Amino acid sequence: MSVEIDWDNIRGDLSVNQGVKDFLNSRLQEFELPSYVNNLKVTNFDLGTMPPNVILKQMDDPLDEFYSYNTDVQLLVELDYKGDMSIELSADLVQFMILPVKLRISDIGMHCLCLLAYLKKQLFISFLCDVSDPLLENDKLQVDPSGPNFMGKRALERISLIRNIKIHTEGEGSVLRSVGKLEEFLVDLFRNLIRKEAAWPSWIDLD
């Protein structure tokens, strides 16, 4: 039941692109940047040249909680994304001196179940879980929003939706001791940002 997807058209739409930088930054600066970093924003988001393998699993109406203080629709979906996605960053290092640096993230790998809710001229992406999550293979997590005790307790047990992720940066010195705490940090941060801000109960909220 595969959903085909005009990736060229989507990839081009800058109403989205901006919307996801904004989503990234907004949520990124709720965090506690350590002492060796300042002025950490997302410069540029770039989608893959190639799309994810979208597969429709179900149609429902958008959850009541997608309603905020038909022609709407809400697709439950399998996302196999082994694509070539890239998020570009801006950062400052720190203490007798400051160096500006530049980073990419790549190799974003998710094989994952996910709600996609077009309502009021406005899309929401809430990732549910990794498809290989043990917590489905044993039932014990209700992932049907039909559908009582949907996402009930034991949601917190979920495995990471990020299956893999690459991150490189742009005299040597022991400053390389720091670009390695950072690349370590941004990863371990950026996983949390997905787990907490794009995975249900949260979501990305574009137009």
From Swiss-Prot:
Its main location: mitochondrion. GO terms for cellular component: endoplasmic reticulum membrane; ERMES complex. It is a peripheral membrane protein. Residues 1-207 form the SMP-LTD domain. It is found in: Mitochondrion outer membrane; Endoplasmic reticulum membrane. GO terms for molecular function: lipid binding. Keywords: Endoplasmic reticulum, Lipid transport, Lipid-binding, Membrane, Mitochondrion, Mitochondrion outer membrane, Transport. It comes from the Eukaryota. GO terms for biological process: mitochondrial genome maintenance; mitochondrion-endoplasmic reticulum membrane tethering; phospholipid transport; protein insertion into mitochondrial outer membrane. Belongs to the MDM12 family. The SMP-LTD domain is a barrel-like domain that can bind various types of glycerophospholipids in its interior and mediate their transfer between two adjacent bilayers. Component of the ER-mitochondria encounter structure (ERMES) or MDM complex, composed of MMM1, MDM10, MDM12 and MDM34. A MMM1 homodimer associates with one molecule of MDM12 on each side in a pairwise head-to-tail manner, and the SMP-LTD domains of MMM1 and MDM12 generate a continuous hydrophobic tunnel for phospholipid trafficking. Component of the ERMES/MDM complex, which serves as a molecular tether to connect the endoplasmic reticulum (ER) and mitochondria. Components of this complex are involved in the control of mitochondrial shape and protein biogenesis, and function in nonvesicular lipid trafficking between the ER and mitochondria. MDM12 is required for the interaction of the ER-resident membrane protein MMM1 and the outer mitochondrial membrane-resident beta-barrel protein MDM10. This is Mitochondrial distribution and morphology protein 12. The gene is MDM12. The chain holds residues 1 to 234 of 305 of the full protein.
